[model samples]
Target chain A: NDQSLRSSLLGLRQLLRELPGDEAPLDALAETVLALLAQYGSLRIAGLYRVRHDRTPEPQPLATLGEMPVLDADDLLVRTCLERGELVSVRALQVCVPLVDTDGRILALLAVEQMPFFVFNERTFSLLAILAGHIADLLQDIDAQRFSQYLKRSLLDARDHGLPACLYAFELTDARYGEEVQRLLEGSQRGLDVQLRLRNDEGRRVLLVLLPLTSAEGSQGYLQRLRILFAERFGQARELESLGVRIRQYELDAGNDRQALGHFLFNECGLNDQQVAV
Target chain B: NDQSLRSSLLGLRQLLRELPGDEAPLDALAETVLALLAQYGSLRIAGLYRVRHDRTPEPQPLATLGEMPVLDADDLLVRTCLERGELVSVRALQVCVPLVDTDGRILALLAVEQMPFFVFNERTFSLLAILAGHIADLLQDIDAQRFSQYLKRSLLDARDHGLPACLYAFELTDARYGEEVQRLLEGSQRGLDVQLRLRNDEGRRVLLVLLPLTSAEGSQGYLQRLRILFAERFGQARELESLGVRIRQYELDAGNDRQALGHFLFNECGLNDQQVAV
Candidate 1:
């Protein structure tokens, strides 16, 4: 067991040394984590969330510890982080801030109630953050990868000449994120950001999409879809402050990994924001 | 709940009846795993593998429990079904095995573990395999999806578009998945399975891709990939086995919310399977 701990620690060090900052966006931070948890054979549920770059006016969750019914999301540890984006942990609570992207992005947050009690620790937060980065990178890379294979499969496996594909990039933040933005009126729950602004295209709504432009017409569809998609997901018309489009070229973007787009394309959200001029 | 479960069950049954007798591809298999885990919550790890046909000759495994960790590939339950390809359940071991591809194609072998003490009921296994057939559809669909998105992103973002693409399909069967597969394998490991077949194309390997009619020539040096792409992921590549291409279109084959292809592509191009090609 001591050897396992040592090995786990060595693994963490190796990870720290080996990992690119982008890679360890989520979990696998320290040496003793897996080693310590493995002893009791505990199953830890590490969750992740994308914290908005600026402090969120209200905490918005990106992902959960998991969707299992046994997993409860309302615990105090989670609440603190959700509200404050602060690293929070509790023994009985059995949750810890695994990775804090520093930019309000809780790239990875671990909930380990099922794991043994001793396995839960306060210092685990910092270690967990490092680990979470590794995990986030692992998952991010994996998605970017599998999705690319998925494209190949689609092109090669499907018979019907293939379908026109699109990515509907919805800005939950712009539609309803941030603090400085004031409410349109009194008592409105919508984020006064994108949800408050109206269409600048002469009554046409500014469409924000993460879509693929299969054809020139698809380019238009991508814009039109921005309103339609948000309407379906949020069940309301988002006032468009500004909108932008990131078109995916099946051959060009991360052909293999799916989430890689987030890193490659979305990572430069700052650049993207500048481009979203009505 | 039973009504919904029954509807779900009936859906699986119908799919089984409807699924063509062919290589069950990736996305469909992933869906099955999702359905199985959601329905039973008993089975944790499901590893499915098959023999690759085109570029190499060896058994391949795809699909994994999203949650659990594989400390040792040898210790992995899928390793058990490599030869037998049967519905295996380790009562004490807390794992279950079910087959995919009816007539010995044995596209995949599922391994489920870590649930409370209980066998996956008959409905569970039946539904799982039936869903496996759909996996082909989903894998391909998912790939198409990511590929489109990747292309869309690159078209709009990468600022450089001369690169032509291929699906670069790869599958990491239990045999090729070694100690280093999990953490380090993300982008590149997809090709590891192919490498195990003692064949290396370097630039041009085992991807079954579709080029846009507009961008017809293979330019090489395109964006990265995955085993990911259960869609293009040929079940296994052993001698005498052939997996057909899903000819729909432009298979950049990347990952989505659930997959990553770039790392696997990197691995496919970088790996030296001299020692591991079984």
Candidate 2:
């Protein structure tokens, strides 16, 4: 039994390792998950649906293994799995596992359409739950990296088009408050504004907001609004210092180059003194 | 046996999932690998060493678990592991596994100092080998991302400091020649030059070279040298068309913004008509 478990674990780890370098990581993930379950748990059919952030947000099919019937986003099982942030089973045969992030956001839904009756048990359920968590982590990371790339490109556009853009860095005193701060910022931001969550060199969570076509003065007004919002929500003083929040701003213009932007990002993150060149 | 294997695989998968999203991913990986081995195989001592690319490239200790003897970079076991790109054993008690990338470059070395007498077996060696491969994949990803950040920062600097920079995109006819082309480019690059490997929208491997403080005319001279080098090594004509290489260049000045850069990157990669904004 120990030998068998060791080999299974080793094989699964190797498969997961090869998942990262794919061009379409989610597609690769969905395919790999189905293949693994099919090999081990007698899973015959399954579908992975990604939560697409469109005008009306819904889970759209990203990958399907075998013949999977179309799944409605509002289906009872799918909705329940998403709302509960866990596995939802119907008749102990049809199951849906919600891929959730740390913020409890449902990134995707994995629906098992068919599997052997003997395989649908506590053991298989637990395995699916663990795999869903791993998938969620990878998906969230992909989303974050894409957003960061967007910000970098936007900064370049601002410089080329002679538009003003301001980057705001909010450093939290305690990482526990990261989600609360992020929610507040996300709610108050404009449709065009981009937000990114990052860990500084010191491992402190920092929230960055990129305001395209906005001047430094324009950003100041937005900052004041955030201050008021934070005070109302957290019951803190107008100064975020009391909430253990420190803020820094860097303005980008035609004159500012990537070197200055790099310095601001790396230096402000507490890596300024490090001799390591960017 | 099947049940036990399922549980262990689930547990290991969950642990690996949590390994990402860390500030120092390599350190997290090193600690996790040692902890897992310690729990399962009575592995009391181990160390992870990262190859630092400096004037004299050598493996430096990144993380260690329990008390371990100091490892010399020139040691026969360590050097052999790296040279062979595989696990090397010394008297069945000590082992060193080289973490190699897709390019066959040794990224790191994992050394085991002590384990229970009963645990030193072929099965354990295979398990260690799989873990080492996983760690190498993660390390390579980290390095690639860091290099990308550096390139983006340099682009910003080129615009801000009014320095000339040229971005060259080399689209290959066949992906098989990617490494050969990369090796040639790496050899000819200047100290300040930066190169990045990327898969475009069509999944074709594209090599990007960023030449900072180099004007259009200056880049022309460099391109001419590359033509000769390609002719000599690849046995292709100076035109490079016969070699199935298509080259595109984007010049950067104070006027170029991040948007233009993004357009160049995404659009040139056969994604020009795609409506999805950066």
Candidate 3:
């Protein structure tokens, strides 16, 4: 079984390392996961659920092997893994593995259906876990790079006359919800707000949300609203000042002296120096 | 065809967005690029050059459409750009665009060939160039993240309490050959040196090299040797002290009160605090 896993992983690795010409990366990725899991676990079906490109909370099926069961967003086992970053068994016949990236966000989930009485061994659990992490990293790398580009374009577009935007930095100590948290925050913000997500040295993930055409006080009030919203969604509302999560709202000024703006982004805004996509 | 091109790139953007399980990010990137170019250009052959995972000097075809050409390392047109980053026409039947990354390293070359008399329009050239740069950014991101992991691993592996390591920073004004320079230095160094490539506020890239089992004088000697070797490889040694190309060295001390190391990495080491990998 381990040999089978290695062979499949090797094939998928080669596919990823070489560069493809036409096939969708998500299809290839999800299909690979589906095929390999079904083959190795001797399962009837396997599939992947991905958060859509728009970062919607809805997880749609990206690919499948054989016939797969539909899972609801409110499915207890799935929601549990997504929120707590855990691997669990569901319906007595399947295993669910959440793929988490470096910032610790659950990027996707792989579900494999097997015999109702079958149980997974430690090795199977660990290998799948490891593979999921690597995939999540690659996925997150793309997202981060794209988002960073968008942020840089926004900054560069501000030119000689800067945009009236306020910056807010929020760090997640249990940063497992890194990008997912960003999605939630973005979903709740006004149409004009922009955000860049980053993880610091100690692995504390931070999201820098920029509200264009908003004042410093306005940004503070906005975060206060976010704090309330986040609590409503997650069940607990701790004061947001701990774990380097304090709000730092400043005019996102830029232009001929872009370095000055860069300084504020790093020294004052608290973005990770090693991970800006730009 | 232009619409087709946009559609293909859009498909690729999605694939890259969702990380394929256990695949090399480079391969996935190159393949995505080749497929789109081949389809959109209606060419018999289209391909990409990727810095192999081993970081070898020879760039190989990671993705290809139709049959491919095997150019020699000494192939004048190919060698000219690989040795010195520049786009060039070769064989009168093929066109090559050297895709450069942030560090000024040539990540790959995208080549397209068709009927012997085929030529490209300004629009075609521009689109290809845009695609190539985006691919380079994706590839460079993967490399940076991987290299960073390697550096961190090496640091943590030093279990003995007695650590004798000094950190030195060097900025490359013409950072175009950053990966190449790092490769050369790594090839020449003993088993005790480490280096991390980074960019600065003004978009200037820097290399942070760490030397273990060394004092300030020892570190200086090593850097001087690197400088001399750099000159031997290139041309006249322009006194290793230019605007974005000076050298700064410090000791390897880190932990809770490690803001000093952070200071040097940003203030002294020249790594762009605005662009951390997180």
Candidate 4:
């Protein structure tokens, strides 16, 4: 039994390394994890209850393996794991394993069943816990990457509807302080709505702050407050002025939406081409 | 034993959640991990291999608990794990746990031992595996944050020595097509050196390409080739001219450096904050 456990734990690690990067489909992840658990001698059935922001809290069953039936789908043990956010077991039913992510949020719950009179041992529980954590980490990365893409697409589409936006270009002389300034801006404007881009200028540090819903006028006010905060963080307001920190804001109307804003930003950063349109 | 395993794994999850964010030191991470492992029954001798760029290929003794000697660490089994880049094991001596990162690079290796005639059981191996992954993930994050800071500082310091860098701004009308153009530029310019930033403007798309250690004239030639490549992807170079996909270049001298570049980008984007040093 001990020998089998060692080999199985090693097998789990190999399985994790082999699973395609975060881009793989969610269903595939669920299926593979279910299959891995089923490899253990007594684990006859396994399924994942996936939670995603795009959908309601309702669970999406990822996969199920073997002939074992769920002990009790509506039992108190299942409900407790769902609400209480940890593993809960019903002696005769099933073991509910909650998959928690880096942020301490439960992303999913894995439920598995054992054969009659074949109760789970220390090896099974520990192995299952590791598997649950690995799955949670993978799912979280996939969610983050997808969310980023969705946000980008949303910003691009927002301009098509004639919604006003502003692109603010903030510059610091010291390239070393680039991230520091960006961090300062992001922290102070925690509740204020804005998207950020750090323009890679080899000679100077530049940060492009994008305000999607705010109009140019609104952006001006936002920048005013941000500059004050920025100045304060660096010490006296005069120190920022003396250091030559500059804030520039550009308003995007329907006529010159993302494209016009793009052209202007590129033109200023000295990343422009002069050949015949080519 | 089974009860102990369940409590240990649950206890581990709590410990991981309690561990401080990336801002905490690496030693603290090592100490905490070692402490968690030691809590399990009979797990005494365990230590971490803290890998850093400055550290040599050999594993550094990060932290240790029980009395375990590294058996034949110079053997091929140990060497292979270091070179081959994954967890490896020796038949009788010890099991080597290689900590790999997102880049598929091995960051460190963890080695451990057990008491006389007492080999690690399934629970111990599974728990150890989870601990290894968690540590690797945390180390990777710290590495990334530190690397970013280093890059920024390097760029800023270069300016002090009078190293010339040209800033090139490239703009496109279709917001979505920006990524395509970026791929085109990055791929075709194989040997040509440059740093890049994508300005996420809501209405339009912009790319700021920075050519460090290059003069304005040299950058012109580079831009000329890129423009041809950019136009070929779209077909009918004339279409670009008509669409107003303009390219503007700004040369960064000591006087204008990052501050001037910021002013230029902001002014072009129509975000001139007339109140400050303009």
Candidate 5:
């Protein structure tokens, strides 16, 4: 059983190192988990969950084994593992552990099974527990490429600008470019509600992801693509921004990819140097 | 309240239309689910389960409304949902409706509301049912992107050949020319990989997604970009019927806005008849 896992894991690694584009990271990461479980043999299921260090679990399974018993969202054992981020083997040798954050806060769970009544050997438990962290880090890195900005934009915005943009709410009389600027933004967004507002919510951390999606580095490839469109259609992104064009990533991986896209008006691509700096 | 729901739903529609790129669709869809629940003054905790046409189901709470309740593995609600993708209302109006496929096959459930005696009315049910289908359709659209032959070559050969193809892959059987290509591909962890078969497989599909990370188009875009890159390079893609060099949307989109990208790349850029046809 582990042989297939090993083969698949190796296949995933090779897929990552050998295949083209960004899928390799996701593949390699998932396969690493699968391969680790297969190597251990006792583990039946491997799941990559992007969790928070908190009382309630944000149940999002990034990846999972294709063959397994149906996943019960309410599985208390699973929930317990999540709450503790502890690798616990229950009943027989059913060991489950939480993939905690760097601060020891529970982030996700990793479960291993055999006889529910058996206990996992110390060696296996430790090895798998440590591996879970490594996989989580990689997941966070990859996920950051997906939708960190979406959360930030939501937490900050109040108006619907119909474009992917971080909305800043100044007093109506605040001196800038007047309603012209707002109108420009509306025109620029071309009727997409990317509008976000910096409201009075002090309790929220405003989860904005700035690295791969909107950051200077991540938007590089996309900006390069859109340069021509703007060149042909408008001359530059500045022109669109003046009109209030906004593009940003909101979905996880899918969001980032779309945000990376260089639309003529850049509908959902995140704000660039000009937009952010201004 | 209804206005907000419709606005959110419309936003969801636009976002879905924008999908397969940035996660705007999923995010908007989730937000819509939450806002719709908001209409029910008593409703709390709206969790959304999305099934990308690609078959990846991402489930998480769209919005949390109240104190969390314990979830059990044997819970009728959870089991009923996984077993059949339909709306299952518990003792309270707390409803769990499964988001199904075209054949009426339920993929996952939208477990909304945690409070007991929570009942979803017909109006809410109808709205959810329609939105579910649209959201799923939008997800599929968001995931729409195809790989090209040229991209595969760049990934496998980029490391062997000195070029910036991003994370990529390729394949070249002839050993005599191997040394030159090897020098180019291995140039950078810039990312590299080689496919055994001509096309991507089940394992390779998700892996190839650049997701704002890298482009599957790889170095292959050079073939379409700089005619000189083709001239300097040994293989004349047009001349090689056997060596299919396909250009992908990733590269096409990447360079779409680029000035240096040259108009020769995109379909609408209006290249010469020969260039466009070839």
Candidate 6:
């Protein structure tokens, strides 16, 4: 029995390792999870839904096994899973696992809908949670890698299409203050804008905002509004710079050289080349 | 008994998911593997050694548990594991698992030394293989990400420090010929040079060579020699260009704009934003 369990785990781990390398990771993951669950719990029905980022966020199914009912983002089970950032019991033989990012934002949900009565137990539920956690971690990595690729594409588009773009660097000495500033910046940015958090060479937290189709003057106005919002929320008379927040803006030009751009970011802007998070 | 096995597997999966996020991943991975193996196999001694790339490569211990004996890169068990790219048993109670990359290169070795007689079996060995495979996959990801970061830093250094560098794009229509070219390029290049294989927008394989501290004239001479070598090896009388191999070179200039660089690479050189492999 111990040998059989070990073999099962070995197979499952191998499957998980190969998940991210697949052409369709979520589909592969959903199928693998369902198959593993079936081996122990006789689980037959499952669905993996990705939380689409929009004005009104919603869970859209990425992969389905058997006959799965349409799931609503506002459903009580989905909401509980997202809000708690963990596995939540939907019913006696049903559960939903929220795939969360580092910031506790639910990126996807794995719902297991059907299983044999004898197989649906505490142990099976624990296994499902573990599998979901692995899937979430893989999704986070995939998203980060894709975002990096998107940034590269955006830069190319800015040059070829003659689009105005600005790169903003916000250096914060304290992490708590950094998080607050990140929220403010995220709230004010457009959907097209991309942001990355990284540690500078000096170990200070730096937030990078890449604003595509935004001109130098446009970025200046955006900065002014952000400063006002910070001051009003913190109830401080001091400017952002006075409170150990350093902001630098670079207006990206069409004729910029790749090496020169790298020089500006790594030397002038003080980016460490190490990404902390996306 | 089944419940206990499920719990153990759950614990192991959780540990593996958290491995790549740790401050010291190899240390965390080694300790976790040893702890888990001990639970079922009563494994008393283990060590993780990373294969350092050098003129004469050797296994350097990254983490050790319970007074592990020194291992030589040339040892029979270690050599077998590396050659076979799998786990190899040295004796009744000891084994070695090689951590391999996508290219089947051994990146590290995990050696388990002392274990109880009854606990040393095929099941325990299989578990070790799975753990090592996960570790290898994680390390490969870390290396690739670090390489991308290094490329960014190298571009910056070229501009700021007045270092001459060249970017070479080799677009090949056929993958089998592409592999041959890749080997030739790898064998001929300096250790400082970085190479990346990616699929272009047209779905053709493109090999990018970033040559730091190599001037435009220097790169031209290097390319001429590579062409000669390729012709000699493949016995082709025609130039490489006639054989469906397109080579483009871009000299890095200190005064180049970032967006212009992106435009050149994406539009002119025809590099896709997507990266295939390092």
Assess chain B of each prediction and give its TM-score. Answer: 0.31, 0.43, 0.42, 0.37, 0.36, 0.45
Per-residue CA lDDT of model 4 for B1-278, tens digit only, reads 12343344345444443455444445556666566655532455656666556323444577776665654556565667667655565544356566655344566666656433354554444445544543454455222343333223224323433334566666665432343454455533422233333343334555555554456776666767776876776664445443435577776555564666556666674322321112
The DockQ figures for the candidates are 0.01, 0.01, 0.01, 0.01, 0.01, 0.01
lDDT per residue for candidate 2 within B149-176, as digits (tens), equals: 4454445435434446777888876433
Model 1 bad stretches (over 4 Å):
A1-278, B1-32, B35-38, B44-66, B71-80, B91-93, B119-278
lDDT of 1 by residue, B83-195 (tens): 55444455323453433332334444445545544445554544444344323222322222333433332222111222223333333222112112221222232210111
Q: For each candidate, what is the lDDT?
A: 0.35, 0.61, 0.55, 0.51, 0.39, 0.59
lDDT of 5 at A36: 59
TM-score of each: 0.20, 0.28, 0.30, 0.31, 0.23, 0.31
Residue-wise lDDT of candidate 3 within B69-166, one digit each (tens)? 66454566666656665556653336666676545577777666552343455445545554565456544543345445434422332221222356
For candidate 3, what TM-score does chain B get against the true chain B? 0.42
lDDT of 4 by residue, A92-180 (tens): 44687777653456776667665334556544555565456545644552222332333342243244344455666667664334444
Tens-place lDDT per residue, model 6, A14-40, is 464434343555556665645554454
- Clashing residue pairs found in predicted model 6: A256-B257, A256-B258, A257-B256, A257-B257, A257-B258
- Please write out the lDDT profile of model 5 over residues B1-278, one tens digit for every residue: 12342354456544443345435444545655545544543456655555444433444444444553433435577567656655566632267655654344454446655533434465555455544543343343001111233232232222322223342223333222232332232221111122211212211111222211134443444334434433445555433212222223334232334342333323323223222111
Binned by DockQ into CAPRI classes (incorrect, acceptable, medium, high), candidate 2 is incorrect
lDDT of 1 by residue, A34-133 (tens): 3333233344443334433342222333333333233345666666765765546553445545444322345444445555566565444444443343
What digit string (tens of lDDT, one per residue) describes model 6 on residues B67-147? 877766677776677677777886522777676654456667777777777867777765555445534544453323444
Candidate 2: where is the Cα deviation over 4 Å? A1-33, A44-76, A89-94, A99-108, A113-123, A133-278, B1-188, B191-278
Model 5 interface DockQ: 0.01
In candidate 5, stretches whose alpha carbon ends up further than 4 angstroms from where it belongs are A1-278, B1-7, B16-32, B40-42, B49-63, B91-93, B101-108, B114-120, B141-278
Worst 10 contiguous positions by lDDT, candidate 6 chain A: A1-10
Tens digits of lDDT, candidate 3, A183-274: 44654454335465566555555666766445565566676778777677565654443222445555654533657656656765555545
Worst 10 residues of 3 chain B by lDDT: B154-163
